[PDB]
Amino acid sequence: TSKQELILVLKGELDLHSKNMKNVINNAKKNLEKYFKEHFKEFDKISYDISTPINFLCIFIPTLFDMNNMDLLKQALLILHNDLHEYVE
């Protein structure tokens, strides 16, 4: 029903394992359970993908939307932002 995507952006100064993908799995997962552990049972799924190693990241968070009130992207927008904000590399 509802579809959302977060245009991530990293750097090409890496040549061994990308923390980007690991950042989504750590968040998309931690966030998911966060709703299941805090709210017991919610309604929202998260996914991600890589758009060329020398271009940009393509995040695709699939959510039905209904009882979220736009309070789940706070972590997604922060994780990606902080990633390209300071460095965290």
DSSP track, 11-61: -S---S--HHHHHHHHHHHHHHHHHHHHSSS-----EEEEETTTTEEEEEE
Residues in Cβ contact with 7 at an 8 Å cutoff, skipping those fewer than 6 apart:
56, 57, 58, 59
Q: How was this structure determined?
A: NMR
What are the C-alpha distances in Å from 47 to residues 16, 25, 44, 51? 23, 9, 10, 13
- CATH 3.30.70.2370 for domain 1-89, yes or no, is yes
> Beta partners for 65?
none
The C-alpha atoms of residue 81 and residue 30 are separated, in whole angstroms, by 17
Structure tokens at 83: 């990633």
CA proximity to 48, closest of 81, 89, 71, 80: 80
> What's the start-to-end Cα distance of the chain, in Å?
35
**What does DSSP say about strands 47-51 and 56-63: parallel, antiparallel, or unpaired?**
antiparallel
